[PDB]
Amino acid sequence: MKIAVMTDSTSYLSQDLIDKYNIQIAPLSVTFDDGKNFTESNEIAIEEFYNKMASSQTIPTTSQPAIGEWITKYEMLRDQGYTDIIVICLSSGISGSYQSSYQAGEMVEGVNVHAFDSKLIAMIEGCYVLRAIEMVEEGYEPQQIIDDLTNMREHTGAYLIVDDLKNLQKSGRITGAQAWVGTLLKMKPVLKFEDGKIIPEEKVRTKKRAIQTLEKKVLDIVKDFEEVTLFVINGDHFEDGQALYKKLQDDCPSAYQVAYSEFGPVVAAHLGSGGLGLGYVGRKIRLT
Ligand SMILES: CCCCCCCCCCCCCCCC(=O)O
């Protein structure tokens, strides 16, 4: 038996982890109506993308990995002797990448494809990749790994803050009054992931208090977990995420694993500027 683990680009794993474990990545893309295209990778400048988003009078569109990017990587790993491929995708409730990875697995002969719906995104989804890789080293078969990841999914979630109200109306999800009235009070919509979908949770005035709301809600949940891994997932507001990150280091015990990360263009294309989230996993994920 020879098991491999791959994922899509929205897992936002560091290039250090990608290189160390030779993780293959099927990238997503974001295409402005300028015709400008950004294929997600650890090479494009995230600052250039945020500048084009502010300059673009229309919101861009994101695309799942094309049914083909999966196929070549499936063919490449099978050639290298891999008998089973575990594919970790972002939430099927917000993207079709999970479906494309499954359908492409039906067209590649001579290798078993085990597509997994993480029901999340960013480094929270990447935690499923690092848990699968760890289990392969310990001698687990793919079915035990899928069952473990399915159990892990039961104690995994995330809350997030929306900051760019201008980006919301450019997409049409809010009005002009609500956009205008919202920025003057500085109302921050707080949302959370639930069964792979993003649903409204609270509406909080000022970003500082919404960050404190993220901390209280997540901490109240992970108190009951035997193992805890917390992930600050920040946008382009460096000071916002660092404040929450350092606040967690002071308020949480060392038994909690607390880490910091940032999301890429595909997530930024939907969140806009100033996005910030707090994810959690009920496990002690190996981040090295
Ligand atoms: C703390 C973890 C969560 C951080 C915030 C993540 C919110 C994600 C927003 C929606 C992204 C949609 C991606 C669609 C991809 C596609 O085109 O198939």
Numbering used by the authors: 1 to 288
What does the publication say?
The crystal structure of FakB1(A121I) was determined at 2.02 Å resolution. We observed two molecules (molA and molB) in different conformational states in the asymmetric unit. The prototypical FakB1 closed conformation was exemplified by molB, but in molA, the dynamic region undergoes a significant structural rearrangement. Specifically, Arg173 disengages from the FA and Ile94, helix α8 (Leu165 to Ser171) moves away from the protein, and residues 175 to 186 form a new α-helix that rotates away from the protein by ∼180° in concert with the movement of helix α8. Excluding the structural rearrangements observed in FakB1(A121I), the open and closed structures superimpose with an RMSD of 0.356 Å showing that the conformational change is confined to these residues. In FakB1(A121I), the bulkier side chain displaces the middle of the aliphatic chain of the FA by 0.9 Å and its distal end by ∼1.4 Å that, in turn, shifts the tunnel residues Val162, Leu191, and Leu271 and pushes against the dynamic region. In the open conformation, Arg173 becomes disengaged from FakB1, and the newly formed 12-residue helix that we designate as α8′ has a distinct exposed hydrophobic surface consisting of Ala177, Trp180, Val181, Leu184, and Leu185. We also note that the disengagement of Arg173 from the FA and the outward movements of α8 and α8′ disrupt the hydrogen bond network surrounding the FA carboxylate by breaking the key Ser171-His270 hydrogen bond and exposing His270 to solvent. The FakB1(A121I) is the highest-resolution crystal structure and was used as the representative open conformation for further analysis. Analysis of the open FakB1(A121I) crystal structure reveals a groove created by the conformational change that forms a channel extending from the FA-binding site to the electropositive end of the protein.
